[PDB]
């Protein structure tokens, strides 16, 4: 198994420079061309430039002139793109791939590394329960919820009774407001099976290295 | 540049059924080397993309062979031979044959499934909420088809646009679906001054709205 691991989510300040990698392992590092490619949030694919470990060798958009540049560690089989000049427009997930050869295309990807560009304080989310009892819910399945208020940046991560309830579970799209962000998760079970069986919200904001669980009660 | 025309949508497609997405090139991309340099490739709602054909016709390592693509150097097809639910997504031409390289916008696959109603639940503010002098009533609308909803929020029976917060779902991956929520936030002041709190749904599956409803005292 190829594995391209992208370096974590960074929140800078705009006219700073980031400097995010890509450590590819699974094949020879230096065989490969490894590429780097820009999504803004509700976008399409811009391509950043290209780089191959054994030369070393580059090719690069120029849209990105001066503000991109794509190094690699042969030591580490490490590849690093550097980001220069930061504005909000470069908030992005960046993604790096690996191109499987003579013109074959990214045929393995990395996970993404979201930067968000901004002046704005991290702020820890506040998560509020949601639970029935003013109006007697449905008949068969219960629906409850986490609402997941006031914090910045993206991203958060949102699982209940830690990941062991995955069924049933849909987790909306943050929306930002106000320089904060707000989200919001329900989980729809059996009748019968709350509360006696406990649920449970876990949300995760590692750019305040807070999570917080939320019991959701009646 | 060189400049991918791709469609942003597709028709819905029948659960099972054939595919196609094409894509337009502003340049021919074969070269005079014999290459052409044209791939596909699909990115799922929340995941990094998957490269599903190189070279226009050539299928990927990791592709399932439901895909296919072809073209005349110019213009291309990607074909799906049976759709799954789990297709679902944004699929993407590229080209490598000129600096700089570029995508297409993409286009987004859906899955046409029956009809289904939302399944409309409301949440009154959390104490906690409250004690921060904050109220936000929530309405999460989950599970429908097809994806055109509105939602409309009344206090003491009265439309209010302000402090309204929406959000959906892509298409489940699994059953075809949407959902939206809906949070009204308003300071605990104002919720504390009005009585009925009302989320009502507009959709094809209902003459009259879905409303869920609850009563502060
Ligand atoms: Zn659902
Ligand atoms: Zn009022």
């Known amino acids: 198994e190829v594995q391209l691991e992208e370096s974590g989510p960074e929140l800078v300040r705009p006219g700073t420079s980031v400097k995010i990698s890509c450590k590819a392992s699974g094949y020879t590092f230096t065989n490969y061309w490894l590429g780097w490619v820009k999504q803004r949030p509700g976008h399409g694919f811009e391509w950043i430039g290209d780089?191959?470990?054994?030369?070393?060798?580059?090719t690069n958009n120029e849209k990105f002139r001066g503000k991109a540049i794509l190094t690699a560690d042969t030591s580490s089989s490490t590849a690093y793109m550097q980001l220069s000049s930061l504005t909000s427009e470069d908030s992005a997930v960046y993604f790096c791939?690996?191109?499987?050869?003579?013109?074959?295309?990214?045929?393995?990807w990395g996970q993404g590394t979201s930067v968000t560009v901004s002046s704005a304080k991290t702020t820890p989310p506040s998560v509020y329960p949601l639970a029935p009892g003013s109006a007697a819910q449905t008949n068969s399945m219960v629906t409850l919820g986490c609402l997941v208020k006031g914090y910045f940046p993206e991203p958060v991560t949102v699982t209940w009774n830690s990941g062991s309830l995955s069924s049933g579970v849909h987790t909306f799209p943050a929306v930002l407001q106000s320089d904060l962000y707000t989200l919001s998760s329900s989980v729809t079970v059996p009748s019968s099976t709350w509360p006696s069986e406990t649920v449970t919200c876990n949300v995760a904001h590692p750019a305040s290295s807070t999570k917080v669980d939320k019991k959701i009660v009646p | 540049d060189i400049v991918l025309t791709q469609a942003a949508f597709s028709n819905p497609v029948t659960l099972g059924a054939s595919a196609s997405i094409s894509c337009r090139s502003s340049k021919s991309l074969l070269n005079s080397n014999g290459i052409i340099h044209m791939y596909w490739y699909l990115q799922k709602p929340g995941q990094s993309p998957q490269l599903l054909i190189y070279q226009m016709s050539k299928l990927a390592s990791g592709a399932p062979d439901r895909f296919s693509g072809s073209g005349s150097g110019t213009d291309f097809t990607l074909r799906i031979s049976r759709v799954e639910a789990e297709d679902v997504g944004v699929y993407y031409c590229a080209q490598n044959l000129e600096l700089p390289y570029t995508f297409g916008g993409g286009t987004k696959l859906e899955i046409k499934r029956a009809d289904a109603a939302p399944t409309v639940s409301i949440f009154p503010p959390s104490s906690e909420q409250l004690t921060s002098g904050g109220a936000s009533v929530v309405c999460f609308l989950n599970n429908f088809y097809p994806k055109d909803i509105n939602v409309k929020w009344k206090i003491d029976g009265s439309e209010r646009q302000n402090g309204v917060l929406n959000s959906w779902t892509d298409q489940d991956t699994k059953d075809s679906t949407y959902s939206m929520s809906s949070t009204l936030t308003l300071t605990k002041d104002e919720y504390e001054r009005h009585n009925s709190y009302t989320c009502e749904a507009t959709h094809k599956t209902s003459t009259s709205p879905i409303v869920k409803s609850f009563n502060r005292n």
């Open positions: 791939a690996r191109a499987g050869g003579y013109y074959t295309g990214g045929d393995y």
């Open positions: 780089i191959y470990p054994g030369g070393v060798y580059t």
